[PDB]
Amino acid sequence: STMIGRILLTVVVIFRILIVAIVGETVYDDEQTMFVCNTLQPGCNQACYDRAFPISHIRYWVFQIIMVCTPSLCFITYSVHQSGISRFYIIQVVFRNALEIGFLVGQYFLYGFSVPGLYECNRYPCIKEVECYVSRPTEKTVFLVFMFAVSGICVVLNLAELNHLG
Amino acid sequence: STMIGRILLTVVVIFRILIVAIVGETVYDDEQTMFVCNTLQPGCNQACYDRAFPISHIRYWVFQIIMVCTPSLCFITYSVHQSGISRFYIIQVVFRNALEIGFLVGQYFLYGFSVPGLYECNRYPCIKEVECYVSRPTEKTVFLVFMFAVSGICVVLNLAELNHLG
Amino acid sequence: STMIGRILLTVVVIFRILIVAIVGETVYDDEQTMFVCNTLQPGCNQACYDRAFPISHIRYWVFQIIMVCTPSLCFITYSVHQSGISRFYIIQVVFRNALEIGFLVGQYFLYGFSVPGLYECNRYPCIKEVECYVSRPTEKTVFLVFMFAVSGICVVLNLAELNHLG
Amino acid sequence: STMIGRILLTVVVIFRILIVAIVGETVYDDEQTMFVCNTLQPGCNQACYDRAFPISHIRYWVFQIIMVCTPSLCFITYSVHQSGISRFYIIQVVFRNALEIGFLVGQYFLYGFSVPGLYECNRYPCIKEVECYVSRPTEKTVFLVFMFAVSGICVVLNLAELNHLG
Amino acid sequence: STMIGRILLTVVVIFRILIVAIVGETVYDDEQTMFVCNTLQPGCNQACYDRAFPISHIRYWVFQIIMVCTPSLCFITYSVHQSGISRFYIIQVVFRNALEIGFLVGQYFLYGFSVPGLYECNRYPCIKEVECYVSRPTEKTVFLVFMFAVSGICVVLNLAELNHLG
Amino acid sequence: STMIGRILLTVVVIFRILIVAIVGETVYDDEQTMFVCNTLQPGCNQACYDRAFPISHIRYWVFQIIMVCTPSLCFITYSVHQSGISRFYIIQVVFRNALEIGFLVGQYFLYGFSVPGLYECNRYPCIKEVECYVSRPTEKTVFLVFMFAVSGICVVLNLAELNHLG
Amino acid sequence: STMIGRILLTVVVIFRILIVAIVGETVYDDEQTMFVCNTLQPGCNQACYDRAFPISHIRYWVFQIIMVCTPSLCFITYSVHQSGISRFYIIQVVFRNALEIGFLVGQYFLYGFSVPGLYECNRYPCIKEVECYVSRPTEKTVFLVFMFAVSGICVVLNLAELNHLG
Amino acid sequence: STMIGRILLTVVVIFRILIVAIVGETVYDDEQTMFVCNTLQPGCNQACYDRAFPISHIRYWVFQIIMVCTPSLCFITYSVHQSGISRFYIIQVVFRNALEIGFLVGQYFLYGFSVPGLYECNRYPCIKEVECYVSRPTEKTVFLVFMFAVSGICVVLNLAELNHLG
Amino acid sequence: STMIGRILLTVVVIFRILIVAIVGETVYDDEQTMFVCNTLQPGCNQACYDRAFPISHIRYWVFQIIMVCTPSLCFITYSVHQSGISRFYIIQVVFRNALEIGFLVGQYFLYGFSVPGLYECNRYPCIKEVECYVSRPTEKTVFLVFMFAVSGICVVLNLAELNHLG
Amino acid sequence: STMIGRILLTVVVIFRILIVAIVGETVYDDEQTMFVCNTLQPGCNQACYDRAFPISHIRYWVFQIIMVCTPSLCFITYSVHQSGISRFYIIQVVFRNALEIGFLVGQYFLYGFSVPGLYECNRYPCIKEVECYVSRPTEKTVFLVFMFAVSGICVVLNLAELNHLG
Amino acid sequence: STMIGRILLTVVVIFRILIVAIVGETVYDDEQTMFVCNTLQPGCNQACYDRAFPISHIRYWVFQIIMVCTPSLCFITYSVHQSGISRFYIIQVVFRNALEIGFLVGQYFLYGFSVPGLYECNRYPCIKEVECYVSRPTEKTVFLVFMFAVSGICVVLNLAELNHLG
Amino acid sequence: STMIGRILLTVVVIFRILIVAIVGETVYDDEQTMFVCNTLQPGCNQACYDRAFPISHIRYWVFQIIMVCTPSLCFITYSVHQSGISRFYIIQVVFRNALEIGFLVGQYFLYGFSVPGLYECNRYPCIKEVECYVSRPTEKTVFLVFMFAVSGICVVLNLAELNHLG
């Protein structure tokens, strides 16, 4: 039971990297160029896009992926110099668990579970409240849900091993 | 008869990967930029494109290709650690069969066998029903039919071997 | 006489791959963006481009190149497993000959020997018949003629060897 | 305590390179194309963009990264020829410390800690003072703060080792 | 004297390949998008660009480079199978000489020694004669002259060796 | 003193190549698309851009970099065949010195030390004199000054070694 | 009672003529120029204006005014020639009564009692049903109601005198 | 019976003059400004308007009205000089009859009984056949029918008197 | 005191007629053509102009002027037929007083004492509330105040005479 | 025979005045606003309209009409002062004859007998020769022919009387 | 001396009326349509025109002309009823003097002696201060100066007569 | 000889009034709307039209006509009061002569003898010198020459009579 867990953790990590690297840069390419508002005022589209989408999903996901692979690099650099290893193993396991839970919680608090098609804006230089329209909302919602599911799997597996050793 | 089946399965898989990777990203590049509707209302083109094309074909095909190669990676990671293999072989064969049938069925239910040149839309902010026009419909239909045929071949071959061992 | 034929066949194949891979993606890049019709009707440019150019030349050529290299991959996979070879050699030679003749015949029936500068269109939503204008017609005609010549050479050489063994 | 410092310095350097190389070229891609001013005068957008953003962040960061890796290349070229090493080690450590402090100080004096959404311009050919509007200000502020933090960590670590040897 | 000639021929060939591959694709990128004519007639820009620039320089140069390297590939494939070589050497030298002289002569007859800034057009659908304007003419003339000079050097060197053996 | 000079020459050369290759292609990408003149005359923007910027900086720098590495390739090809070397060393040193001084002098005579924001034009089809406006002038001036400084360093170092041997 | 009726009839007639002649030509001046529909189809505004407003109010009112003054002109021309008058008086009274009742009934059946601000159209070349927008609807409704009231007064008065003589 | 005929002829003539003079100049005011065709070709609207409407209705009606009042002016000028009258009366009656029949016949042959909403055009510079759209067709048809009816009445009355005297 | 009152009443009436007739038609000529709102929605300008200005000032003033002159016309028609006059004088005086007070009260309730430069609109098809801008507001306010003053003078004078006779 | 000639001359003169005064100002109203040329050059429409139509027909006709009525005014002013008349009669007859022949000859030499629909122009600032398009050509030709006919009648009649007295 | 003064006063009054009535309505016709500001903000042209030109010159002049003719109408109405005249003459002279001095003083305080070509504006919705441009400034200044001169003459003459009687 | 001079003076005056009143208002109607300059700068068309045409011809001619009829009005008002006349006759003759010579001299100094088709402008806000284009130049030159000729005739005639009396 603890034997297969490692194998699947390695497989889940690689699957996630491949999905982000190959297709996600091209779902988000037209995000601001196809964002449009009903107005004749210069500068309102810029302000409303910035308030609706402060950090794009794809940037957050690349950052998370890189930061959850840092403990391994540290351990690798140490072992290369070596040429108390078990204590290092323990500590890096602890750190990886913490980092992945933090990133999942932050995703829920920043973005939620859906991307709507309409947005209501009241930022200067817009006069009163205006209505704006988003590009490709259904595809972006599907990507969000898939990523939450994969990261949950990873959290479960790492807790499994943490509680297995104790 | 069971000897050549493996050889051709390997060849079919590689052929499919090459076709998707080299040309498909560039048939679909202008999908929304050349989609147009007869209207003066801001935001109708966005809503109508999202309702006509919820998930693009090329995204679905990349995802399917990656997911049908996961059992092999698991088996490979196990065997590398090894340095009951036959039971693992049996189980992974079962899983691959199931995954490919699911993906083919889903394709039929999501997209059908053709891409029409006209689309009729009734989503807010469009006033009543409007008519919209698609880019490159004949080429997209040809790609759809070819992909269904290749995946059918793969399903047949894997069932062949499953029933051969029994 | 049969000695040099193999050497030149290998050279012809590589030459064709290089020409298609390095320059052809950029002759065809502006095909629809620089296609224009004399009209004020929304959707006519889309319909007329699709009827004039159903499958682009570059897509057809990539597909042909990949499909004529499949018998070699099958033979290679077999020989790797081996670690009646001559019968396999015979059969794959037969198949390659057939495939290349089919592709050349199809090219002649789909495209002909020239690309004209004007096109006459009568598809809905266009009112009666309209006149449209093509991008880079002379360069596209030159590419067509060159490709027919190379494929003819390959057909001749493979028949040479087929009749040599008998 | 001095053992782990080297390991983490190597890890920090690699992390910074990866973040700059993979995502930063695409946050800044639309910087001038989505910069807009309220005016009908030809040439004002150009003058105001140049005065607001003299050197782009991404250019400065690439330059800094390359220049802080020069002492290592010199030491490497010397040691390759060798096939007083400790004196060379001392001097290159001194130089790296100096270079990183200079670059951090310059960042603070050139850019500060935020990117505002509005800009006020009074350069010819603009008539009196005009108001202009920036693209993606919140994301650019986040990137600035992250980079200052990483470079601070590196400064601390290198001073640690400098004072350790003495 | 015959010793250094081979060394410099190899160097000239590599220099030419590098210049064409690294920069030439980006001098010619805006050739049709920045070509403009004084007219209100739909389709005249297309017809006039095609008549002024039938085959672009960069396409001709890539083709020439690939075709002058074919005799070497044939000789290489033969020698690999070998594992009358001197006769093959003689014949391939003859062929290379002929091919390079043909390509230089064709360049002179197709393009000349300059690219003008204005062009005068009388092709349907243009009414009578119209005036059109070219992008980046001085840079294109400089590239033309440089390429003629390099190819001349290569012709001289290969004739040198041909007459040396006799 | 002559020992370190070689090490630093190698380091300077590599630094220059990296700066040109990684960032310079993207400072100059919008050079003509963001060049604008105050006029209603077709063709004036084209003529004025060509007269203001005959050869772009980035093209000149790529060419210089490639040409200053040619003596090394010749020497390398000779030594490979070898498997009076010192005479070849002497001559190639002489040639490299000459080439780098020529390129620096030409830079000063072609471009100077600054790029202005305004340009005054009197070329046909422009009526009398018109005023035009440049993109990103401050960044381009900074790049110019940096490149002059690096090439000066290289000139000094090579003269050092030339006078050292004598 | 019959004495004042004639005086007021003369006054009502003159009041109506003055109102139509002085102001009504300028309420209706922008009727088609400010009529607008949500569409990109050429010719839909024309078809929809013609179907919504077949005969303009002001034309109908001018025609009615002229036709109800014809019996008087006939009687006047007769009496001028005279230089059974009572029989002519009787007959012309009968005719005037009939004409004014017909015109009032026709007004009710053609136009009703209000002019709405929105109009729904389904005439060729419009695709399906479209929405259009009217100019100055409230003012036009007020004018309609006033005119119905005045004509009713006139009908009552003329019947009064008809029944008075008997 | 012949007594009233003169009275009504005078009344019919005056009624016709009033209708043409007061309202008809403003039904036809936007005839060419609101005529539109589906095309991008300069000059097609002009050619198609001229072919659809060679002489406007209002011009023809003004001309007819003036020419049918010429015999009276001649008779008046004669009688003023007088200060065989019956012979002049006879001849002028004959001439008036002839003129009014000619004008009615010409109206039928030039215009017919309706004005359609669509027009089909094939005149240079239009490419093949194009579709054009007319302004206010229903109102123009109503005016046509009314004018034919009035002129018929006048013809009948004048023949009445001609046959009465004999 | 009662002698001059009649003289001034006649003078006030004539002054008012002249001011309305000569200049007011040209202050109001561009009322809707220069009314503008900040929106991209078709039909909002029409709806907002109709809600802000239901009946134009100039129409109301022409109507009032005509209706306050009706009692005089009735009295005149009676006296012409005459060829109890004092009772008719009494009654018409009463009616004129009433009519002028009603019109002044209505002006105050319909329009007030000022015309603002901004207007806030929330009528369909406008999305939420929009801001619109008026033409020539200061001149229109001046005209309003002047007209209220003149009508007040007339009211005072007519009451004077009414109370004088008693 | 000489009796009726005077009567008809008076009638012809009045007919001509009425036709010019009532309708001709409105055939020519859009002469320059609907004149269009195929070009993008500023100022070409102005130059080409001025060269095609130097003096408009309607101006020439008004001038002619006024100048042919001058002898009568002189005679009238003389006779009014009188309160050798026959000599004045003779001289004024001579002058009127001469003036009308001159004006008819000038019409033929200035305008001819038709107005074409196309015009070919080669005036600065137009580049080479351009094609332009005229408004309402058929109606203008009809007006020309009618006016020539009327003036011919007048010439004949005045010569009649001149030769009658002798 | 007092005899001619009356004659010239009558002549001056008539001259002024003719100049205002015949030409001034057409100098001012394009006042707002040719007023333009350098801005992209909706509503700024309206606000700036209203602040620069609160009451147009031509309106003020018509009003003044009508108000200075009121004393004469009162005197005329009195004298007509008459069918102490000298006292009425005295009083009306006093009133006319006062009215004309008031109007001249007001002109100086409202408009001054010139109309400039540029105007500087800072009214909402304009962002900060903007520059605007006026139509026909020189002609408007000439009209202003002429009108001041004429009114001064009238003031002088009326004071002359006032002091003459005493 | 002095008898006819008066008759012709009266005729010349009336002819001039008729020509100015009937046609000149419509040659000049599009003077600024069809004036165009080659520029993208806001406000340059306004400044250049004002500098090229400070006072329009038609305004100057109306003013001159009114001012040369003032002496007659004075004489008429005097003679009406009369109900030394010869002295008044003498003085008014003197004044008329002077006024007409002044107006002719001023015309020559203000306008000359031609109106050119091109105009060269250097007024702010135009950048350096720009080229502008005039409407209807040939017709305006013809009108100028005709008016100079008529006024010369009048000058000659009035001097004739002045010298006749002496």
Numbering used by the authors:
A (entry chain C), B (entry chain D), C (entry chain E), D (entry chain B), E (entry chain F), F (entry chain A), ...: 19 to 101, 194 to 276
Task: Quote the study's own text.
Connexin 36 (Cx36) is responsible for signal transmission in electrical synapses by forming interneuronal gap junctions. The direct connection between adjacent cells is made by end-to-end docking of two hemichannels (termed connexons) from each cell, each consisting of six protomers, thereby forming a dodecameric gap junction channel (GJC). Cx36 is mainly expressed in neurons and forms the major component of GJCs in electrical synapses, playing important roles in cognitive functions, including memory consolidation and epileptogenesis. Here, we determine cryo-electron microscopy structures of Cx36 GJC at 2.2–3.6 Å resolutions, revealing a dynamic equilibrium between its closed and open states.
